[PDB]
Amino acid sequence: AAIDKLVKASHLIDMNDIIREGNPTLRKVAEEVTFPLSEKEEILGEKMMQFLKHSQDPIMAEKLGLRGGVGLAAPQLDISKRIIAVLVPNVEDAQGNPPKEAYSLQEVMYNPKVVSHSVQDAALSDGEGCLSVDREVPGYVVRHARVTIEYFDKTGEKHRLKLKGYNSIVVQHEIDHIDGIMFYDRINEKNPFAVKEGLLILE
Ligand SMILES: [Zn+2]
Numbered sequence: 313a314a315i316d317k318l319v320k321a322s323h324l325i326d327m328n329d330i331i332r333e334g335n336p337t338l339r340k341v342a343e344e345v346t347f348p349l350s351e352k353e354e355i356l357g358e359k360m361m362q363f364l365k366h367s368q369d370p371i372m373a374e375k376l377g378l379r380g381g382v383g384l385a386a387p388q389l390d391i392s393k394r395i396i397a398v399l400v401p402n403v404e405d406a407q408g409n410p411p412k413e414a415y416s417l418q419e420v421m422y423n424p425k426v427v428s429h430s431v432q433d434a435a436l437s438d439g440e441g442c443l444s445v446d447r448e449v450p451g452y453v454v455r456h457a458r459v460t461i462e463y464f465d466k467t468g469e470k471h472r473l474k475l476k477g478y479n480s481i482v483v484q485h486e487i488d489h490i491d492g493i494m495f496y497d498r499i500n501e502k503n504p505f506a507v508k509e510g511l512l513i514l515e
Pocket residue numbers: 323324325326328329
């Protein structure tokens with residue numbers, strides 16, 4: 313099955329393991345994982361983080377044929393399980409110095425969910441995209457500005473975390489995949505660029 317191919321020790325995830333818009337797996341509600349994790353679930357989560365690290369490394373991305381990315385969900389690999397990975401790098405200053413922290417967010421999350429959020433909405437100014445989608449899709453993807461999430465790590469430890477700004481937007485995009493929701497479902501149907509008053513537009 314797909315899981316067997318992905319967790320082979322020598323196998324690296326690349327664009328060929330990523331399913332396409334139209335595949336029914338992307339519209340299911342993914343199945344909760346149970347703890348303690350199987351070996352396959354543990355390995356999958358590590359290969360997903362490895363994919364993101366490779367995607368962000370100019371050379372490995374070139375070698376493997378990948379573009380830069382900050383989030384991945386197991387449904388996109390044809391695995392209907394509530395596992396996501398997020399990797400959001402901080403940026404160099406104007407003199408070229410590395411940031412104090414390499415990443416503003418770095419996690420493999422099992423069974424994540426939004427437990428509360430702000431009344432205010434937000435959206436990225438430049439819209440969103442998706443590895444499973446090979447269409448230009450314009451518009452503002454309207455999300456919760458701020459969220460409190462819960463999730464479990466690979467050991468089974470529960471975490472509760474508040475997020476805002478770009479990290480909020482990323483985590484929301486990945487949780488949507490495990491609920492069978494696509495980014496363009498949150499784009500206004502008649503004017504993609506419509507702005508209801510009070511929308512926070514992120515730059
Ligand atoms: Zn592969």
